[PDB]
């Protein structure tokens, strides 16, 4: 990567070569796009595995369900052309990006029509509400890989092909990582975790237009050696770096967050109108909650036993979620709006 | 850090924020420069070490080499109008920059000095700064490893950084001049003097390592990259050299190298074969030891080597007097107690 940065840092101006770690989830990226593998090669792989008793796909990414609803139509075309009783039914993607259980092997006898790249009694669900008819123990999951890059001048292209088998890793050549003076980043496509060093090295920040459930590849982390499993602040079931770097003092594993929502801000400070104090009295964690009840009234008095201030805070559109285990003091939690991750 | 690069698929600009990992060691053209703590600050923690038993100071980078040469005339000027009998002497540095086993500290009384900020030789008493191994000034009483970066400074023409005094003795190098940096598939770890790169083709191995100096601080665990379930005895630039804890630190039927031409100083790791000589594999070998140079004294180059359970392209050092082959690649068509092997103890 041969370019200059500005690193504000104060002052400075340096010029040359190397690695730079963009962030791309503060930017609303429309450059990145997900180009599928081949129309019959996928249509033929999703007609084997119905027959095999795969229910649907759940995706691995928010940019591989925009692929999905995009191709969906001729997905069916395909399918429709060929004499076959099956529909494709793509839904959207609400809260966490639940993992399934099987996947989709590589199409052997696949079809032939005009190329060869890029409402009937049975579907052939995609994403979408969690229904017991079509359970997640029978839909395909984290079953595609990157092939290379593209251009465009106005979005670049990622070509997709069939893994070689079954992992529960994410994808390695979408993730990033750096460490440069005090300053550290765990990059993603998704994710952007942010650590810095004032007489330790704890996490700062946090921003997540997703929340995944892979695991993050080890060869990507940095100081990922001596990592207790009950310290990540985020948990290693939703894609959290296992390293050092994430974490945060007197917070061990927020397992009961507000991973519901889907987007996230982690970040260490107040909601407004609240106020934290440390005292002894306080019970032991459990669910975060949110600062304002169903009702619509706000409690002020919260407390923590053993926490670090600033507090622990995630926002997102509901609105202000504290920590796991910062508790309130003038309302009772059994009125209050509590995280639905069910532990 | 604002900015934008192009990419290494010919043309992608994108321009934001995030993390640039430069090189410095082919930038050159005097990027960086060190600036002292005060003038009456160090002469006092000099003497206080002489008066304690230290007689000699050993740099840690080649970096800080360069500052002390270029204060040394005005520390001698502030101990001769103190009354002290003692000069400084500062000299170079050649091959690896050695160990030193102790340390100075922060002076609570300071020296006289009429600025705050930067004959007969006679003086007997001499505090020796770097320069050749010597036996009459040990490494066991040498200071080294006791300072560290403070903030970046100003500067158009160049950049400066600020130094102060340790709180403790650590072997662990300073944090504040690394980085390391991870995307798609290719890695890599920088210093001031380091640079080591790393990709992934079938695997995730060492790819090309420059050197313009030979360090022996620890590489700190917070700038590595996949640290766990790393052996010590099989990263390719050993641990006693600044070689970063990493499983990216690794080349496969290559072990560690103890015993390479680490005297040479600059150094530049690659994998090829050198000119007019070929490498075979052959379980009829010999095992490891020394690295060996593809020319003898009198300049005579040997043509075949044989190797045990490499992997091909070789291990291949380059410095100033020529190739030097791995500890693993073992010559054929000359004995090697007729050859130039390396300094390194062994």
Redesign the interface.
């Given at each position: 990567?041969?370019?200059?940065?500005?690193?504000?840092?104060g002052?400075?101006l340096?010029?040359?070569?190397?690695?730079?770690?963009?962030?791309?989830v503060?930017?609303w990226t429309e450059?990145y796009k997900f180009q599928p593998e081949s129309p019959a090669r996928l249509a033929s792989a999703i007609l084997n595995a119905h027959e095999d008793g795969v229910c649907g796909i759940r995706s691995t990414t928010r940019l591989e369900n925009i692929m999905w609803k995009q191709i969906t139509n001729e997905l069916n075309y395909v399918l429709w052309e060929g004499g076959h009783d099956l529909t494709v039914v793509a839904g959207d993607v609400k809260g966490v990006l639940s993992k399934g259980k099987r996947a989709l092997a590589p199409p052997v006898n696949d079809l032939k029509y005009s190329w060869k790249t890029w409402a009937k009694n049975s579907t052939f669900l995609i994403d979408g509400p969690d229904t017991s008819e079509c359970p997640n123990e029978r839909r395909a999951w984290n079953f595609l890989e990157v092939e290379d890059?593209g251009?465009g001048m106005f979005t670049?292209n990622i070509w997709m092909k069939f893994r070689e088998g079954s992992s529960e890793v994410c994808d390695?050549?979408?993730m990033?990582?750096?460490?440069?003076?005090?300053?550290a980043?765990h990059?993603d496509m998704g994710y952007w975790i942010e650590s810095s060093k004032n007489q330790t090295?704890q996490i700062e920040k946090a921003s997540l237009i997703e929340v995944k459930t892979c695991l993050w590849p080890?060869?990507?982390?940095?100081?990922?050696?001596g990592?207790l499993e009950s310290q990540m602040l985020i948990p290693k079931a939703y894609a959290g770096p296992?390293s050092?770097?994430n974490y945060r003092q007197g917070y061990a594993t927020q397992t009961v967050g507000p991973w519901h929502l889907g987007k996230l801000e982690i970040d260490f400070g107040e909601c407004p109108g609240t106020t934290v104090t440390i005292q002894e009295d306080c019970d032991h964690r459990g669910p975060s909650l949110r600062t304002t009840t169903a009702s619509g009234k706000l409690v002020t008095q919260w407390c923590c036993r053993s926490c670090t201030m600033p507090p622990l805070r995630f926002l997102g559109e509901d609105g202000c979620w504290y920590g796991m285990e910062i508790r309130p003091l003038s309302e009772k939690e059994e009125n209050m709006v509590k995280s639905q991750v069910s532990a």
């Open positions: 990567d041969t370019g200059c940065a500005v690193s504000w840092s002052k400075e340096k010029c040359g070569s190397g690695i730079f770690v963009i962030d791309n503060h930017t450059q890059y251009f670049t390695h050549r979408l990033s990582a750096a460490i440069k003076d005090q300053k980043v990059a090295w080890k060869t990507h982390t940095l100081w990922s050696n990592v296992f050092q770097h």
